[PDB]
Design a protein around this ligand. Structure first.
Ligand SMILES: Cc1nc2cnccc2n1-c1ccc(Cn2c(=O)sc3ccccc32)cc1
Lengths: 535, 411
């Protein structure tokens, strides 16, 4: 029953016109259901036959619901959709369960045969003209046009949510207590009434909707909703099944990482560093890619986590929002968002994408930021952070760091591993210390280079290098220097590159050299670096 | 009656997405818009409107009243022909010469003149919801909106009249109108100036609720910023290196700056802390260069067809150096900025002010806001910029990554 609601004026893109696509004559067994169904839809008013001369047409097809016997009509509107103007994107972005305020009772209502019960702007009805064939190419006369929002049309979702929002308003007024959240075709109604008081309102709405032409049904809490197994006071992700295979393709490792990520928002410790490091190469789907010892050990560690089930609690706008961060492996972090000790609202992880020689003080900051955005999206406020780092440690780095930054409120939480500043450079040369004038270079052609130094004390060295870049050498120079030096050194390099990599004070970039230089700076008591115009 | 507004052909309206807001800000935007709706300044709209422009909530200067701030940067670009050519607003190349320039907020004027019914659809904006639980309230403007350059453009006429009776009385005060602000300049004495502004404020208010407010600037102090060399008593090998370091860098800007004269004091692998004697036979270069660095280079003309670029460097200790330019190493201006170390002030709050500072100096000097190369993280800025923001306009920005000696230079 088409609703009495107002229609939304629609138009076709600036200089276009409606679909003239001609109907492909086919099976008369199909042309059997097309008339059978159009007939019923014509009665219900969803459609109407129109004057012979409607210059447009959209192909009609016919698909049988194998299991039922009842055919279903299908209209491939894709050509019209190309000619139909743009609408306010059916606001995508599905609410995160961790942000919904807990309720005593929550019911869902399937507003399925809904959009078909909504009038379509008059003047735009013609462009929705289709044509049911005949016994045989002679009687084309069977021509209709929709009077409601045609499934698959472009502006259907938009004009429906809209129409629905308007329809619910008169009801939400009479019922300020409850809250309704529409989504695609499933209504959510929650309240703090009483199980039976709540049962009276739900049936009230149904009648209200019905008085608007929209029809509803006469599951339970453990809901189906988009990857979320829902409950009477908790939420989680639909059960997961991580594949066991002897061979893996790009297309398999992708579905694995995806599945594993989806788990993150509730399963603490989930990792993907190695499993996704595999896809580094070109996206050549179904390319059997060999596993790895790390990647295999990793997939395992996740399996042991996924073992037991993990549940999530809802939102209580009454308490605070706390977030805590734990540094796991090198380059990976995890955090939990909660309002009550050990019983999370939601969880997740962070990782240094490029990783180009970074800092744990900096990554921890990237995480706090990453969590702040997320919190705002879900809760409309930021959380109070609990962090494995010493205020003094942080200040030291932020006050001396070139980029501006700023972390919300955060208290210290002495919980190893703590956050690192393993070594600091000397702001001023070191008196009485040997000075090395390191440097090196390679041949962009031969792939061969030399890395050495010349000390003020007359000592000098020069080591041969193969398969090296002019940046690998410049760091090999600095390395040599630290090796052939006392506990205090003064190094002078020609490479801004190397200078800066060290000034950023990275860590275990699993770049053996850069990790070796780092281990050396830690051992020294005082190191002073300095740069001088190359050559 | 409407003043036909067209988008630069081959261009469609704005479709920018709304940034997520704190529940606090959502709340303020809701009250404000509900009032604006009552007063007919805006109206609700349906899905038949694919357009959208961002909205923030800021605190006006000195009040605890929330202010709506629609980010029209995109619609401004998509209507540039309208407000830059068809209705341009010539900029007084002498407003920078006055001794004191006050800034007045006249944006409240625009809410008078109604907007071209056919253009309205392009001002669509969305008050968001938390966690997506709801669709989003959608409005479009019915009157000229603030932040949209087309607004002062259309209103000039009505402005030019209301201001006539004042420009005649004090033929020496300069008045420039940019966006929703008036930049009044004068060579009077602080005491009188504040008086002439209050005169103007009351004038404006008599001729129709054109109610303004107050910001003290002083162009005549906005002098150069020549780089400085650090002359000492003694000089180590190191100091000379760093000195040669900055000098060999200055040579991308200044011509007569040569250093091969000082490079002969680091001759052959010498200790770092080893004090080096001061050779006079060289000082005819240091001394010669210490001067070349006080008075600017030839050329450097403001190209009006080009864009203004503002880079800022964190100098630490609540200090920030900056430079505006159009083509690398030909700065049209360079300054500094200092915070006020207590009860607040973090990097972010500072940067935000330094940006607002530089932008106003820009409007006043070139009638044009620049594009900033902000040394900060895109997401961090996107998170807090809106906290210490007072301006009613928003510049264009982008985020950079690590200045080699560009910071150690302007120190
Ligand atoms: C918040 C709450 N407390 C509950 C208590 N008992 C049972 C279910 C409960 N829920 C609950 C159940 C399901 C859903 C998911 N959900 C739907 O399906 S429809 C819909 C629209 C908007 C947002 C979410 C949503 C969201 C919350």
């Amino acid at each position: 029953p088409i609703s009495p609601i107002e229609t939304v004026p629609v138009k076709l893109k600036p200089g276009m016109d409606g679909p003239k696509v001609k109907q492909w004559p086919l099976t008369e067994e199909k042309i059997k259901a097309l008339v059978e169904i159009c007939t019923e839809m014509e009665k219900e008013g969803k459609i109407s036959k129109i004057g012979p001369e409607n210059p447009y047409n959209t192909p009609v097809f016919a698909i049988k619901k194998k299991d039922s016997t009842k055919w279903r009509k299908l209209v491939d509107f894709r050509e019209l959709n190309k000619r139909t103007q743009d609408f306010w994107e059916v606001q995508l972005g599905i609410p995160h369960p961790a942000g919904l305020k807990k309720k005593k009772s929550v019911t869902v209502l399937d507003v399925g045969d809904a959009y078909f019960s909504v009038p379509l702007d008059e003047d735009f009805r013609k462009y929705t003209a289709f044509t049911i064939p005949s016994i045989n190419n002679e009687t084309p006369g069977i021509r209709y046009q929709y009077n409601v929002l045609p499934q698959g049309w472009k502006g259907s979702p938009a004009i429906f949510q809209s129409s629905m929002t308007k329809i619910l308003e008169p009801f939400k007024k009479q019922n300020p207590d409850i809250v309704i959240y529409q989504y695609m075709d499933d209504l959510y109604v929650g309240s703090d009434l009483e199980i039976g008081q709540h049962r009276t309102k739900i049936e009230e709405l149904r009648q209200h909707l019905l008085r608007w032409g929209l029809t509803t049904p006469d599951k339970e809490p453990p809901f189906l909703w988009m990857g979320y197994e829902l409950h009477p006071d908790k939420w989680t992700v639909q059960p997961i099944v991580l594949p066991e295979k002897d061979s893996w393709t790009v297309n398999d490792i992708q579905k694995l990482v995806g599945k594993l990520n989806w788990a993150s928002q509730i399963y603490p410790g989930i990792k993907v560093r190695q499993l996704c490091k595999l896809l580094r190469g070109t996206k050549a789907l179904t390319e059997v890619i060999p596993l790895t010892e790390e990647a295999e050990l990793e997939l395992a560690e996740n399996r042991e986590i996924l073992k037991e089930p993990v549940h999530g609690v809802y939102y209580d706008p009454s308490k605070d929002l706390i977030a805590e961060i734990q540094k796991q492996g090198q380059g990976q972090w995890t955090y939990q968002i909660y309002q009550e000790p050990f019983k999370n609202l939601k969880t997740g992880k962070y990782a240094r994408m490029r990783g180009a020689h970074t800092n744990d003080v900096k990554q921890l900051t990237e995480a706090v930021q990453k969590i702040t955005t997320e919190s705002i999206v879900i809760w409309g406020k930021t959380p109070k952070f609990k962090l494995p780092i010493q205020k003094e440690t942080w200040e030291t780095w932020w006050t001396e760091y070139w980029q501006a930054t700023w972390i919300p409120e955060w208290e210290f939480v002495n919980t190893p591993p703590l956050v690192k500043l393993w070594y600091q450079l000397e702001k001023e040369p070191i008196v009485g210390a040997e000075t090395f004038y390191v440097d090196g270079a390679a041949n962009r052609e031969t792939k061969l280079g030399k890395a050495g130094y010349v000390t003020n004390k007359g000592r000098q060295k020069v080591v041969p290098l193969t398969n090296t870049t002019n940046q690998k050498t410049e760091l090999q120079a600095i390395y040599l220097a630290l090796q052939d030096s006392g506990l205090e050194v003064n190094i002078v390099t020609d490479s801004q590159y190397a200078l800066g990599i060290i000034q950023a004070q990275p860590d275990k970039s699993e770049s053996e050299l850069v990790n070796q230089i780092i281990e050396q700076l830690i051992k020294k008591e005082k190191v002073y670096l300095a740069w001088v115009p190359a050559h | 009656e409407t003043v036909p507004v067209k988008l630069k052909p081959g261009m469609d309206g704005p479709k920018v997405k709304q940034w997520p807001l704190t529940e606090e800000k959502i709340k303020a935007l809701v009250e404000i818009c509900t009032e604006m709706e009552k007063e007919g300044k805006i109206s609700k709209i349906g899905p038949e409107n694919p357009y959208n422009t961002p909205v923030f909530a800021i605190k006006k200067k000195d009040s605890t009243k929330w202010r709506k701030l629609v980010d029209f940067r995109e619609l401004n670009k998509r209507t540039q022909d309208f407000w830059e050519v068809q209705l341009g607003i010539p900029h007084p190349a002498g407003l920078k010469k006055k001794k004191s320039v006050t800034v007045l907020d006249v944006g409240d004027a625009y809410f008078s003149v109604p907007l071209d019914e056919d253009f309205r659809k392009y001002t669509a904006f969305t008050i968001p919801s938390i966690n997506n639980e709801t669709p989003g309230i959608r409005y479009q403007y019915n009157v000229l909106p603030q932040g949209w350059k087309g607004s002062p453009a259309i209103f000039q006429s009505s402005m030019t009249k209301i201001l006539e009776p004042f420009k005649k009385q004090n033929p020496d005060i300069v008045i420039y109108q940019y966006m929703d602000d008036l930049y009044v300049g004068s060579d009077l004495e602080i005491g009188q100036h504040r008086t002439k502004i209050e005169e103007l404020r009351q004038h404006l208010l008599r001729w129709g609720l054109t109610t303004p407010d107050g910001y003290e600037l002083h162009p005549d102090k906005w002098t150069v910023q020549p780089i400085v060399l650090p002359e000492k008593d003694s000089w180590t090998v190191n100091d000379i290196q760093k000195l040669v370091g900055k000098l060999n860098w200055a040579s991308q800007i200044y011509p007569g700056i040569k250093v091969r004269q000082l490079c002969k004091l680091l001759r052959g692998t010498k200790a770092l802390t080893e004090v080096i004697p001061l050779t006079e036979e060289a000082e005819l270069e240091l001394a010669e260069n210490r001067e070349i660095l006080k008075e600017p280079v030839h050329g450097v003309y403001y190209d009006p067809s080009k864009d203004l670029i503002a880079e800022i460097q964190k100098q630490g200790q609540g200090q920030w150096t900056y430079q505006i330019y159009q083509e690398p190493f030909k700065n049209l201006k360079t300054g500094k900025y200092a915070r006020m170390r207590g009860a607040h002030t973090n990097d972010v709050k500072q940067l935000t002010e330094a940006v607002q500072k530089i932008t106003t100096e820009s409007i006043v000097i070139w009638g044009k806001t620049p594009k900033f190369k902000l040394p900060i993280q895109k997401e961090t800025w996107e998170t807090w910029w809106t906290e210490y923001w007072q301006a009613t306009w928003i510049p264009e920005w982008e985020f950079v990554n690590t200045p080699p000696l560009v910071k150690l230079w302007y120190q």
